[PDB]
């Protein structure tokens, strides 16, 4: 068989969504910021629990008015990755609106069990402002969402987080 999993990456402008995707797919990182204006995807062949799957990873605009255009691409997603910046508490605050907007627009049949994963990114930086335990509490309050702390720049937890993403997305 061939299984294609659709994964959607959401989060505020600048949290590192594009960087996380680029680190996972191409093992490349750039400190140069170019803002994502249009949603678009990369494809990667992933191996999950001795099963080969094609992961279609969608990168979206975090910017405040372009993000409504991302909504058209929610439909059919098998997993939703929510990303925030551990140094920027305003990007943590928006996770609920991102999640609710995804749930009502994508409209899975089983919203309580739909696969989310939450990445708290940029831990390589100094002076984090969002406490690990605070993010963990939010994730737990949403029916035990898996939480990873990542660094796209230093390649910490990117592979592990996307392995969980692949696995939960693959669940029938």
């Amino acid at each position: 068989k061939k299984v294609l999993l659709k994964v959607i990456i959401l989060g505020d402008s600048g949290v590192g969504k594009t960087s996380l995707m680029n680190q996972y797919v191409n093992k490349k990182f750039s400190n140069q910021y170019k803002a994502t204006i249009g949603a678009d995807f990369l494809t990667k062949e992933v191996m999950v629990d001795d099963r080969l799957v094609t992961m279609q990873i969608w990168d979206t605009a975090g910017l405040e008015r372009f993000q409504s255009l991302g909504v058209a691409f929610y439909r059919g997603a098998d997993c939703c990755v929510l990303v925030f910046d551990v140094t920027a508490p305003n990007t943590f605050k928006t996770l609920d609106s991102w999640r609710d907007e995804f749930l009502i627009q994508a409209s899975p049949r089983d919203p309580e069990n739909f696969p989310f994963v939450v990445l708290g990114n940029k831990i390589d930086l100094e002076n984090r402002q969002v406490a690990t335990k605070r993010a963990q509490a939010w994730c737990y309050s949403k029916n035990n969402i898996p939480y990873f702390e990542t660094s796209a720049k230093e390649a910490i937890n990117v592979e592990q987080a996307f392995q969980t993403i692949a696995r939960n997305a693959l669940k029938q």
Binding site: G38, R65, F66, L69
Partner: protein, 137 residues
């Protein structure tokens, strides 16, 4: 030469302040689903030599100006009169637009085909002050 269909649509939507349609075009452009230069210049009598940014600044379509600037529009493009978008926001007395353009490092020293700078084109005394301040930098 010619403009693509997406470019004509971008000039039309920018001119008329259809911000959602501008953003749909900019998103399609960013992922290369359509061919269009954000800095294109109009080729019909309705927009000849103007960029989307010129049109949106002159007609005061604020959200459009923002969206174009966030998507990377060049702030110092010239139209056939030698005007920059700053020239046309200053001329029409749009304080928030002049301020937005300065925030994107608009060159306040450009002299248009009439021998005027943006400071010389305006009538609003606040804009005249802002431009005077940025000139001496």
């Amino acid at each position: 030469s010619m403009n693509t269909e997406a470019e004509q649509q971008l000039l039309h939507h920018a001119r008329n302040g259809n911000a959602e349609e501008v953003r749909k075009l900019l998103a399609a452009m960013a992922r290369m689903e359509v061919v269009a230069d954000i800095d294109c210049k109009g080729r019909s009598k309705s927009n000849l030599g103007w960029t989307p940014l010129h049109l949106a600044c002159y007609f005061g379509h604020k959200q459009v100006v923002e969206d174009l600037l966030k998507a990377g529009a060049k702030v110092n493009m010239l139209n056939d009169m030698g005007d920059t978008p700053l020239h046309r926001a200053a001329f029409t007395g749009r304080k928030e637009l002049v301020l937005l353009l300065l925030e994107y490092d608009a060159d306040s020293t450009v002299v248009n085909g009439s021998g005027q700078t943006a400071k010389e084109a305006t009538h609003d005394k606040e804009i005249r002050n802002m431009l005077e301040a940025v000139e001496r930098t």
